[PDB]
Amino acid sequence: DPTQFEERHLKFLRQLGKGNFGSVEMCRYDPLQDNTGEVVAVKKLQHSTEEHLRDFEREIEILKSLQHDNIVKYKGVCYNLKLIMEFLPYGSLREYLQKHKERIDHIKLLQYTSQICKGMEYLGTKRYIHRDLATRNILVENENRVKIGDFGLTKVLPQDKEYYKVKEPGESPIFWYAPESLTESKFSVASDVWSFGVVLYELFTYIEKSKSPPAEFMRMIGNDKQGQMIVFHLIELLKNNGRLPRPDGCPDEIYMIMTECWNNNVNQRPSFRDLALRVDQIRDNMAG
Ligand SMILES: N#CCC(=O)N1CCC[C@@H](n2cnc3cnc4[nH]ccc4c32)C1
């Protein structure tokens, strides 16, 4: 029923991103062919396996079930299955921050952080595990609002368990992964909290390249480090309390929140509700 979009009326404008077996394009949906249609974002499989099709169908059903100010809006589907979403004109929070860092102060990062926590808490409410929290997957709707913007790796918890075990082919964002995701392939609300700690780290480094999680972890492990052993060495590092450093300029109270997200003890990480509470309290206090 979703105002199904006809493919012939979708006009390609440019690519927005890639995965991951996915890609997102900016298109103009122009059914009257008079150049008055709205611009939308279109996600499609970059190589349409039938297994990837199944995952994509599931991704679509997930986004469709989500309605929240901080979750990118589902608009419909076009079928060659394509997912149609609203286009957020500021693009990803990653690129936004890279290009506007002199305009975006700490209070503003905490506003975004708070919105990300609210979005994630809403997911947890549906027993959805995001599994890929990272600033390149957060979108900027306007200067005052961000949204979680991709759900390609999102899973629903089994009914009887608080974690979902999954091992995917090819490449993982290991430098955002909780220890138990690396060692046991276990993903849970708590591993999303671990990765949220890494998102907060990213925000406060202002996406400085030499400071990215991969660069810092690689540097702590040693870049004689030869790729298969990398995960093994990363595991050992985390187990011995190796951690991303406090970013330049970051207050101790904000770093403390990161470090608490990065607890090896899965059950000792903060909830997203407590995170929002704490972040909002630091905001109110930075007011004056
Ligand atoms: N496949 C895939 C990932 C991808 O292409 N991304 C990551 C998630 C955000 C994507 N993106 C980049 N700029 C965007 C603007 N609006 C968007 N609406 C939905 C997605 C979306 C936008 C890019």
Domains of the chain: 1-87 (3.30.200.20), 88-284 (1.10.510.10)
Q: What is the rounded distance in angstroms from the CA atom of residue 103 to the CA atom of residue 210?
A: 21
Q: Residue 161, Cβ neighbours under 10 Å: how many?
A: 11
Quickly list DSSP for 163-175: -EE---SS---GG
SS3 label, residue 268? helix
Token digits for 65? Answer: 């079930």
Residue 21, annotated as binding a ligand: yes
Q: How much distance in Å is there from the Cα of 152 to the middle of ligand 1? A: 11
Q: Which residues pair with 129 in a beta bridge?
A: 155
For the beta carbon of residue 48, count every other beta carbon within 10 angstroms. 13
C-beta separation of 275 from 117 below 8 A: yes
23 is in an annotated binding site: yes
Closest to 112 measured CA to CA, from 263, 256, 224, 254: 254
Resolution in A: 2.2
Buried b (16+ CB within 10 A) or exposed e, 87-125: bbebbbbbebbeeeeeebebebbbbbbbbbbbbbbbbbe
Residue 123: C-alpha distances to residues 26, 54, 120, 232 (Å): 26, 21, 5, 31
Residues 6+ apart with CB under 8 A from 83: 42, 43, 44, 56, 59, 60, 63, 74, 77
With both helix axes pointing from N to C terminus, report the angle between 189-204 and 93-100 in degrees, rounded to the nearest 10. Answer: 20
The strand pair at 74-78 and 82-86 is best described as antiparallel
The verdict on whether residue 24 carries a ligand-binding annotation is: yes
Please tell me the distance from the alpha carbon of residue 162 to that of residue 155, in angstroms, as a whole number: 12
How was this structure obtained? X-ray
Instruction: Give Rg (Cα) of the chain.
Output: 19
Give 209's contacts (C-beta < 8 A, 6+ positions apart): 215
d(CA 97, CA 115): 16
Residue 139 CA: which ligand 1 atom is closest? 9
Bridging pattern class, strands 22-29 and 10-18: antiparallel
Q: Is residue 144 packed enough to be buried (19+ CB in 10 Å), middle (13-18) or exposed (0-12)?
A: exposed
Distance 196 CA to ligand 1 centre (A): 19
Task: Compute the half-sphere exposure of residue 113: CA atoms within 13 Å on the CB side of its CA.
Answer: 31
Report d(CA 178, CA 266) in Å as an integer: 9
Q: Phi, psi (5° rounding) for residue 219? A: -65, -40
Q: Cα 2 to chain center, whole Å?
A: 26
Q: Which residues contact 173 (CB under 8 A, 6 or more apart)?
A: 132, 134
Q: Is the peptide bond before 20 cis (omega within 30 degrees of 0)?
A: yes
CA distance 14 to 23: 11
Residue type, 135: T
φ, ψ for residue 83, nearest 5 deg: -100, 125
Whether 95 is in the pocket of ligand 1, judged by its Cβ within 6 Å, is no
Residue 130 burial by CB count (10 A; 0-12/13-18/19+): exposed, middle or buried? buried
118: enclosing H helix or E strand: helix 106-125
Residue 92 dihedral angles phi and psi, to the nearest 5°: -75, 155
Q: How far apart are CA 149 and CA 9, in angstroms?
A: 24
Classified as helix, coil or strand, 88 is: coil
CA 145, CA 40: separation in Å to the nearest integer? 18
Q: Please tell me the number of Cα atoms within 13 Å of 288 on its side-chain side.
A: 0
Q: Is 186 helix (H, G, I), strand (E, B) or coil?
A: strand
Taking alpha carbons only, the member of 67, 188, 69, 195 closest to residue 134 is 195
How many whole angstroms separate alpha carbon 104 and alpha carbon 97? 7
The number of C-alpha atoms within 13 Å of 248 and in the hemisphere containing its C-beta is: 7
Report DSSP letters for 198-218, one per residue.
Answer: HHHHHHHTTT-GGGSHHHHHH
Q: Write down how long the chain is.
A: 288
Give nearest CA residue, ligand 1 atom 17: 87
User: Catalytic site residue 132?
Assistant: yes
Give yes or no for a contact between 279 and 106, defined as CB atoms under 8 angstroms apart. Answer: no
- Closest-lying ligand 1 atom to the alpha carbon of residue 21: 1
- Does residue 283 contact residue 111 with C-beta atoms inside 8 Å? yes
